[PDB]
């Protein structure tokens, strides 16, 4: 079946540098988008979404024309002390009444020092 894996538990980065938060899924099926969030609670912040919204400081590590891509690592540019926290890589299942959450990675601690 499929698992969403975040290998790095902690990572950090000086101000103005690029932090890499890596994520890899085992399989593409069930079909669904991969989203990155900061925090686990109800008021969590969407960090990256491929289809909609603009996330300027986020770049996809797997890069374009990566066919059948299963590497869902992200890169957050120009890091500030404000962007410190725990980031979760979550897999979603395609669903109407709005999509549904399926599996979430352990999480990667980001700091700033």
């Amino acid at each position, epitope marked *: *079946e*499929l698992q969403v894996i975040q290998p790095d538990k902690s990572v950090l980065v000086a101000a103005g540098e690029t932090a890499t938060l890596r994520c890899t899924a085992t*399989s*593409l*099926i*069930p*079909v669904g*988008p*991969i989203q990155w969030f900061r925090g686990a609670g109800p008021g969590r912040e969407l960090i990256y979404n*491929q*289809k*909609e919204g603009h996330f300027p400081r986020v770049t*996809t590590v*797997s*890069d*374009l*024309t*990566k*066919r*059948n*891509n299963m590497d*869902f690592s992200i890169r957050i540019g120009a890091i500030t002390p404000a962007d410190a926290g725990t980031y979760y890589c979550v897999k979603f*299942r*395609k669903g*109407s009444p709005d999509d549904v959450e399926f599996k979430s990675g352990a999480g990667t601690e980001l700091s700033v020092r």
Partner: antibody
Amino acid sequence: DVQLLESGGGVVQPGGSLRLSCAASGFSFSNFAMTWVRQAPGEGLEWVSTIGSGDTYYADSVKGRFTISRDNSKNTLYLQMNSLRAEDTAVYYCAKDSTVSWSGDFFDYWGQGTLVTVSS
Amino acid sequence: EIVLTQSPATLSVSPGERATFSCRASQNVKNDLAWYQQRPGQAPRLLIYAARIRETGIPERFSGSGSGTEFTLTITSLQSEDFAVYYCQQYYDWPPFTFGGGTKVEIKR
């Protein structure tokens, strides 16, 4: 190389049933979604259904009548069609799904198609 | 739910010239567009996915461009093989996949 070979298509009455099979080869059938797309005579392509790994999706005109099934032990994709309507007459294509980057699911390889004829 | 409209539904071009046709969508802003080529007695084959990415084994003449609602497929030098029907497919928003009406590239005489 990737090959998709359909079978089980023929002529049946309205309201009859028919089962289509598409045996996949040349790629890891277990790690990809598979799709059926039909094309009526003298008209364009229309998407029917899509299966992933227990998640199934159906077209609006098809929701209640058709069920997509796959068996990884046979590397085959199935589409059993029940309560067949006369308009459902089309050439049924089995296709393999592929994703670019983080956006997902266009059709890279298409089967040669099996002809189904719903008529009295 | 996102319907694709293809204009020049039929397009008459001379061999060796250039043919350009457009696909238009409602409610999709991104590049999740695919182009397909189908010959009369044959199954469709993928030419371009993600608007501008040309599939392997496809000649350089075929080229896709555009984003948002307007998209276009271009062939530099029309050959005998290129005369077929061409469909656009979006995978941006789908519980239901959707195909374009199709543009048939036709020989002009």
